[PDB]
Design an enzyme around this catalytic site. Structure first.
Site, short mmCIF file in Angstrom:
data_model
loop_
_atom_site.label_atom_id
_atom_site.label_comp_id
_atom_site.label_asym_id
_atom_site.label_seq_id
_atom_site.Cartn_x
_atom_site.Cartn_y
_atom_site.Cartn_z
N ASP B 159 0.78 -1.25 0.00
CA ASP B 159 0.00 0.00 0.00
C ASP B 159 0.82 1.30 0.00
O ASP B 159 0.35 2.32 -0.50
CB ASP B 159 -1.02 -0.03 1.14
CG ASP B 159 -1.99 -1.20 1.01
OD1 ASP B 159 -3.20 -0.98 0.85
OD2 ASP B 159 -1.51 -2.35 1.02
N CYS B 191 -1.53 2.80 -12.86
CA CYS B 191 -1.57 2.61 -11.42
C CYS B 191 -2.64 3.58 -10.91
O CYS B 191 -3.69 3.64 -11.53
CB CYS B 191 -0.18 2.82 -10.83
SG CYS B 191 0.67 4.33 -11.36
N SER B 192 -2.42 4.30 -9.80
CA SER B 192 -3.36 5.35 -9.37
C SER B 192 -3.04 6.63 -10.10
O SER B 192 -3.84 7.14 -10.87
CB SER B 192 -3.32 5.59 -7.84
OG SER B 192 -4.06 6.74 -7.45
N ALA B 193 -1.84 7.14 -9.84
CA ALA B 193 -1.42 8.42 -10.39
C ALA B 193 -0.95 8.27 -11.83
O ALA B 193 -1.17 9.16 -12.64
CB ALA B 193 -0.33 9.02 -9.53
N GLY B 194 -0.31 7.14 -12.13
CA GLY B 194 0.23 6.86 -13.46
C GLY B 194 1.71 7.20 -13.58
O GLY B 194 2.17 7.54 -14.67
N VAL B 195 2.47 7.06 -12.50
CA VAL B 195 3.85 7.54 -12.47
C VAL B 195 4.86 6.53 -11.91
O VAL B 195 5.65 5.97 -12.67
CB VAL B 195 3.96 8.93 -11.78
CG1 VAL B 195 3.39 10.01 -12.69
CG2 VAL B 195 3.27 8.97 -10.42
N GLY B 196 4.79 6.25 -10.62
CA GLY B 196 5.76 5.37 -10.00
C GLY B 196 5.58 3.95 -10.48
O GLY B 196 6.37 3.44 -11.29
N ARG B 197 4.51 3.32 -10.00
CA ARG B 197 4.23 1.91 -10.28
C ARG B 197 4.27 1.62 -11.78
O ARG B 197 4.98 0.70 -12.23
CB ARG B 197 2.86 1.54 -9.70
CG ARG B 197 2.81 1.50 -8.19
CD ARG B 197 1.48 0.95 -7.68
NE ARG B 197 1.23 1.28 -6.27
CZ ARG B 197 0.15 0.93 -5.58
NH1 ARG B 197 -0.82 0.22 -6.14
NH2 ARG B 197 0.04 1.30 -4.30
N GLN B 235 8.81 6.99 -9.20
CA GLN B 235 8.62 8.20 -8.41
C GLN B 235 9.50 8.23 -7.17
O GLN B 235 10.00 9.30 -6.82
CB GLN B 235 7.15 8.35 -7.99
CG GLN B 235 6.82 9.58 -7.13
CD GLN B 235 5.57 9.39 -6.28
OE1 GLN B 235 4.59 8.85 -6.76
NE2 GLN B 235 5.61 9.83 -5.02
#
Lengths: 534, 514
Positions: B159, B191-197, B235
C-alpha cells in the site's frame, strides 16, 4: 410479568444476583424430518441448525427430487400469531427459494441483522442487486431506492413472478459486531422502532434473518414484540415470551449475552420513552420537558450520564485526564492519540472528537487525518499547521499549505478556511484537507439563530468530502460535542423531518464520556433546534 | 550500459556506497492541455503535450520501450468521469493489452475506479473470462464501438513502498511480456497516479528485453529518456532501487519456468552446476526480524520472520506461505506445544482455514472432551482411515468449531500423514498424497495449515509440490526454482540442503509420464 415501573430495578437485580445465568440455563430444555432429508443438505448453512416441522415454512412443490423446503419458521409475536418468519441467511443455492418464499407468503418487509462478510467469513450471500436488476429463478428483483445510514440501510425493491410489480422493503442492521452484542443498546432500539413503525403498514408476515437464523434474528423478535407489549399493556415478559417461541424455532436468542442485552436495551426504552419528535410537535415537546418527581429534562439528562483506559505511561500525551477516550470509541493511529470516534446520522464514525494538539502530538494529529483519510477539520478555540515557509514533515507523508481565505459571517466574525495537501513520501497518494477555525462558538451574545449558520456552511463542505470530520475544541469536550450533535440533528431534521436530541447526546456521551456533564448544555441543544423549525 | 556479467556486482556496489540516492537525486531535473478548464486525479500530476494521448483530453502519455518507440501508453487510473474516455482511448489506439498495477481500494483509499464489469456487460465492454492467481488476475474482455482485450491485474502490490519480494513482480512482467509479444498496437499501463508503479513496470519490462536481445541493461540511461515523455516515472528512490534488485534476480535466475515438453531436457541440464547455481540463490537483499522476547518459551527451536509472521488476535510460531492461487495459500508452522494448542486452534478460527495437513502428540479433542477456547468450542465429528497404495494410513478426522458468542460453525478436516515422503516406497507414490489433499482443498475455503515437527523442510516440500501440481495442471508449466525460493524467503531455514531442493525436481519429473 413485570410492569414497566419495576422492570428497570428488576433488571439491575439480575445483574447483582447473577440471575441471568440461572434464567438462561433453565431455558435450554427442550422433530425436524424435512430439514434432515438428504435432498435438503445443501439448503442448510449449518448441520446442527434446523427448521422444526410444525413451524417450518412450506413452499409449493414443482418440477426426480423434492422442492418444498427452506430453513425458516413462523414465529409468534406478542398476542400476534405466525407474525414473523424467522429464517437463516440465504446461500447462492437457496437465493431463489428465498425470493419465492417472499412471493408465496405475501412478504413486504425483510429485517436483516448481519453483513454478507464479517472478519473474512461468508455469513450471508447477497440475494439482491446492487445494479438495477437481478433474476433469481422465476423471480425478478429490480431495486428502486437505497438509503444508507449510520447503523442501518433501507433498500426498496420490487418483485415480479416472471411467469406473468409488488414493492418489498429491506431493513439492513449493518453495524452489529462480529461476535457478542452491540456495546450500545440505544441504536439497535431505534432501528427496531424504525422498522416497527413502517412494518405497522405491511399485510403479510415480516421475514427476519441473520447468518444462522437463531440468535440475532431471535433477539429482534423479542425486542420488537416486548416493545409492543410495553406500548399496549405496560408490561414486559421476556422469559415468558422467549420460552414460547423457542418451541417454534431452535436456539432463538442463542447466547446468554443476547438474553442480558435484550433486558438492558428494553430498560433503556422504558426510561427513554419515544424521544424522536416530528416537525409538528417540536414546540409542544420542548415545553413539556421543563414543567414523576421531576422534569423530563432532568429525567432525560440523568440518562445521558450512564470502561477501560489506555493512559499509563503515555499519559503525558493528554491535556486533561478529565476528557480521555474509552477503548470502544478510541481512535487508533498506526500508536496512541487522545481521540474518540463519534457517530452521526449517516455513518458510525462520522466524526472524531479529540483535543487541540500538544506540540509533541502535532505529528500524531496529522497522522490521524492521514490514516482515517479525513478531508475536514473543524477547530473551535496555538498553530499546529504548516506555512509555505516550512511544510510539516511526517515520515510517510508531507503536510503543505495551499490556500487561506477569511469569511465574514452575518455578525462579522471570521471563518479561517485553509486548504492543505498530504502527499505520500512512500507512494503517489494526495489527501486534500480543508481546515476551519471557528470564532467563539456558540457566541451566546449573538442570537441562537446564527449558531446554525456555521453548521450549514460545514454541512455543505462535508457532503463533497469523504472520510470523517475531525472536530477539536481545547479538550474534546462540550463545544466539539455540540457541533457533532447539531450537525447530526440538522441532517436528521432535513431528511426524516424528525429530531431525537436525547439519543444524539447520549450516543455522543456514551462514546466520549465527559462531553455533556451539565444540564444547561443539554437543554441548549433543545433550544437551538427549536429556532430551526421556523 | 552495464553488461549482465557485471550488473549484479554493480548493484551491490550502489547498496554499499549508498549511491542509489546520488543517482536518484541527479535524475530530479510543458502541459497546456492538462491545465485546461475533472479528469486529473491529482493537481501536481500531468500529461506532457508532446507525449500526451488525444473532448480530446486524457491524462496519459506514449512512452518508448527499448528500441521500440511509442510502445506503452503510461496512463493514470481512471475515475468514473474518465472511464469512457479510457475505453475510447483503447478503441482509438488499437490497444489489446492493459497492465494494472494497483487495487481499486487500498487501506480504505480510492486509488482507481472500476472501469469494467464484474457482471456480464456494462457500457460496450462485455467480460468473457477471468483468472485469479496469487499475485495477479487476468481478465478477458471484448469491445464494440456502439475486438478482444486482455487486462493484467497485478493485485498484491503493497500500500506504500515496494514489494518485499521482487520474485513475483518479475514473473508477472514475464507473464505479461510473453502474451504482449504478439500484440500489434501499444500496451496501456496504469496505477493510481500513473507515475511510479506504472513507470517501474515500463523500465522492468523493457530492460528485460534488453537483457534477452542485447545482454546489457541501462536503467539510469533508459529512465532519464522516458522521464521526458512523462513526469515522475519511477517516483520514489525505493522503486529505483527495487528495479535493480529485481533485474539482478532475473539475470541470475534466467527463465526457470519449464513447459511440459522440456522438463526432461531441463532437469538434466541442472547437473558449478545449475542445481548448485540455483540452490545458492534460494539462500538469500531485504532484512529479517525474529522475536524472541520472553514469549520465546512458545517455540520448539525454525522461527517466523515479520514479513510472513502469522497473526493470531497474539503470537504463534507460523509463517504465511504462498501458492498458485493466493498469496497466503498455506501456513507453515510447528506442531503444538501443550500451551500453544489453544493458540493453534485460534489460528484456524481467525484465518477460517478448513484443511490441516500433519506430517510426522495429540493436540485435538475426542468425543470424551471437546476443547474449550473462549470464543469457540472444538469438537470431533468423524474419523476415517484410508489405505494408500502401499498400505499406509491417512487419518482423516473432521471437526467443528462453534462460536461460544455467536452462531458461526467452522468445518475443519484433518490429515495425519505417514512417514512422508516414504523413501522406501518409490517416488511415484509421493505425489499420490498431494493429489488427494489437492482435490479436498479445492472445495474448501481459507488457507491450508501444514505442520511437521518444526515447520521446516517436510512441510515446505508439501506446499511446494502442491503448488507445482496446480501450476502444471493449469498452465502446463513448472517453475521449481521460484516455488522453493519464495517458500525459503517467506520462512527461512525450510530448504538448507541441496538434496531436498533437487528432490523437488526429481519428484516433478516422475509426474510427466504418458
Amino acid at each position: 410479568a413485570i410492569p414497566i415501573k419495576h422492570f428497570p430495578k428488576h433488571v439491575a437485580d439480575l445483574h447483582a444476583s447473577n440471575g441471568f445465568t440461572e434464567e438462561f440455563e433453565t431455558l435450554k430444555e427442550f422433530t425436524a424430518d424435512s430439514s434432515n432429508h438428504p435432498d435438503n443438505k445443501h439448503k442448510n448453512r449449518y448441520v446442527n441448525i434446523v427448521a422444526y416441522d410444525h413451524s417450518r415454512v412450506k413452499l409449493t412443490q414443482l418440477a426426480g427430487k423434492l422442492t418444498d423446503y427452506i430453513n425458516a419458521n413462523y414465529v409468534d409475536g406478542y398476542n400476534r400469531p405466525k407474525a414473523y418468519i424467522a429464517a437463516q441467511g440465504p446461500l447462492k443455492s437457496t437465493a431463489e427459494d428465498f425470493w419465492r418464499m417472499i412471493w408465496e407468503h405475501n412478504v413486504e418487509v425483510i429485517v436483516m441483522i448481519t453483513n454478507l462478510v464479517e472478519k473474512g467469513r461468508r455469513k450471508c450471500d447477497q440475494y439482491w442487486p446492487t445494479d438495477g436488476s437481478e433474476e433469481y429463478g422465476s423471480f425478478l428483483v429490480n431495486q428502486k431506492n437505497v438509503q444508507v445510514l449510520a447503523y442501518y440501510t433501507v433498500r426498496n425493491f420490487t418483485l415480479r413472478n416472471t411467469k406473468i410489480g409488488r414493492l418489498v422493503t429491506q431493513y439492513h442492521y449493518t453495524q452489529w459486531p462480529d461476535m457478542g452484542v452491540p456495546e450500545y443498546s440505544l441504536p439497535v432500539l431505534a432501528f427496531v422502532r424504525k422498522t416497527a413503525q413502517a412494518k405497522r403498514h405491511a399485510v403479510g408476515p415480516v421475514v427476519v434473518h441473520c447468518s444462522a437464523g437463531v440468535g440475532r434474528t431471535g433477539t429482534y423478535i423479542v425486542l420488537d414484540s416486548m416493545l409492543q407489549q410495553i406500548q399496549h399493556e405496560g408490561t414486559v415478559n421476556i422469559f415468558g415470551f422467549l420460552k414460547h417461541i423457542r418451541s417454534q424455532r431452535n436456539y432463538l436468542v442463542q447466547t446468554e449475552e443476547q438474553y442480558v442485552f435484550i433486558h438492558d436495551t428494553l430498560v433503556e426504552a422504558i426510561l427513554s420513552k419515544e424521544t424522536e419528535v416530528p416537525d409538528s410537535h417540536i414546540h409542544s415537546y420542548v415545553n413539556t420537558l421543563l414543567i414523576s418527581g421531576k422534569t423530563k429534562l432532568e429525567k432525560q439528562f440523568q440518562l445521558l450520564s450512564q470502561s477501560t483506559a489506555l493512559k499509563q505511561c503515555n499519559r503525558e500525551k493528554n491535556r486533561t485526564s478529565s476528557i480521555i477516550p474509552v477503548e470502544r470509541s478510541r481512535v487508533g493511529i498506526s500508536d496512541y492519540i487522545n481521540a474518540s470516534y463519534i457517530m452521526g446520522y449517516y455513518q458510525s464514525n462520522e466524526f472524531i472528537i479529540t483535543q487541540h494538539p500538544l506540540l509533541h502530538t502535532i505529528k500524531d494529529f496529522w497522522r490521524m487525518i492521514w490514516d482515517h483519510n479525513a478531508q475536514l477539520v473543524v477547530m473551535i478555540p496555538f498553530v499546529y499547521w504548516p506555512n509555505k515557509d516550512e511544510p510539516i514533515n511526517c515520515e510517510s507523508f508531507k503536510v503543505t499549505l495551499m490556500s487561506e481565505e477569511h469569511k465574514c459571517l452575518s455578525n462579522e466574525e471570521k471563518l479561517i478556511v485553509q486548504d492543505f495537501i498530504l502527499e505520500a513520501t512512500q507512494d503517489d497518494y494526495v489527501l486534500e484537507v480543508r481546515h476551519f477555525q471557528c470564532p467563539k462558538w456558540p457566541n451566546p451574545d449573538s442570537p441562537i439563530s446564527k449558531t446554525f449558520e456555521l453548521i450549514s456552511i460545514i454541512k455543505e463542505e462535508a457532503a463533497n468530502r469523504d472520510g470523517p470530520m475531525i472536530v477539536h475544541d481545547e479538550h474534546g469536550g462540550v463545544t466539539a460535542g455540540t457541533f457533532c450533535a447539531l450537525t447530526t440533528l440538522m441532517h436528521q431534521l432535513e431528511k426524516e423531518n424528525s429530531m431525537d436530541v436525547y439519543q444524539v447526546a447520549k450516543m455522543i456521551n456514551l462514546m466520549r464520556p465527559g462531553v455533556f456533564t451539565d444540564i444547561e448544555q443539554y437543554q441548549f441543544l433543545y433550544k437551538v433546534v427549536l429556532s430551526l423549525v421556523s
